[PDB]
Amino acid sequence: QGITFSKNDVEIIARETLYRGFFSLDLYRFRHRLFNGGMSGEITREIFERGHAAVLLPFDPVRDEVVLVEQIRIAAYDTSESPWLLEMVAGMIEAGETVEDVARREALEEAGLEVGRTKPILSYLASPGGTSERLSILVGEVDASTAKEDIRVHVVSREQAYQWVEEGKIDNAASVIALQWLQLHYHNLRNEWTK
């Protein structure tokens, strides 16, 4: 069951740089196997390359609270209520860094929070038709009574945060995914982290 093909079923002819700045835009030139047999001809796709990221949902299991960070994301401007988004702690992963190391470090730099235990939520591709970006989300144990780019730190109840997902007030993929996951898993998580 599940996916039909493997990495061996593609031929990446070229990854040609279209733009080289802080990030990159690459033209992938490739062929790939067809479900009915044989290979495609050459196909090209423009792919935004910005490396990958670690994401941390800071959850206080004693108080049933989430810590959110607020900062401007200018790309949200054209389609959003405001470009200041309420987000998860997150950071890009640089060479040799692990997801958990980045998540724990960014919790301290962005929320002023020390993380205790962590558990994986999931790792997802943000928009794989046009970008390679993968983001790996952890939930991290925090004490939301602990006090601390231009960031403002918010502490809200889990119920409020999830209601803001339902209402569309929180609508960035990382936060939606993490908070939907929390809504599905928080009972067991509180059990585990308050035992």
| Rg (the chain; Cα; Å) | 19
Phi/psi for 140 (5° steps) reads -125, 130
Residue 90 binds to Mg ion (criterion: CB under 5 A): yes
Among 62, 72, 76, 92, binds ligand AMP (CB under 6 A): 92
Which CB atom, from 11 or from 109, has the smaller least distance to ligand AMP? 109
Site for ligand AMP in 101-160 (CB under 6 A): 129-130, 149
What residues are paired with 24 via a beta bridge?
A: 20, 49
Which CB atom, from 15 or from 117, has the smaller least distance to a second copy? 15
Instruction: Compute the distance between CA of residue 97 and CA of residue 109 in angstroms, rounded to an integer.
Output: 16
Do 186 and 158 meet the contact criterion of CB atoms below 8 Å apart? yes
Which CB atom, from 37 or from 129, has the smaller least distance to ligand AMP? 129
Residue 147 binds to a second copy (criterion: CB under 8 A): no
Q: Indicate which of Mg ion, a second copy, ligand AMP, none lies near residue 184 (CB less than 5 to 8 Å, by partner kind).
A: a second copy
The C-alpha angle with vertex 84 and arms to 82 and 90, in degrees rounded to 5, equals 140
All residues at 6 or more sequence positions from 153 whose CB lies less than 8 Å from its CB, including other chains: 67, 68, 69, 70, 110, 111, 112
Which CB atom, from 49 or from 64, has the smaller least distance to ligand AMP? 49
Residue 93 binds to ligand AMP (criterion: CB under 6 A): no
Provide the binding-site residues for ligand AMP, judged by CB under 6 A: 22, 45-46, 91-92, 129-130, 149
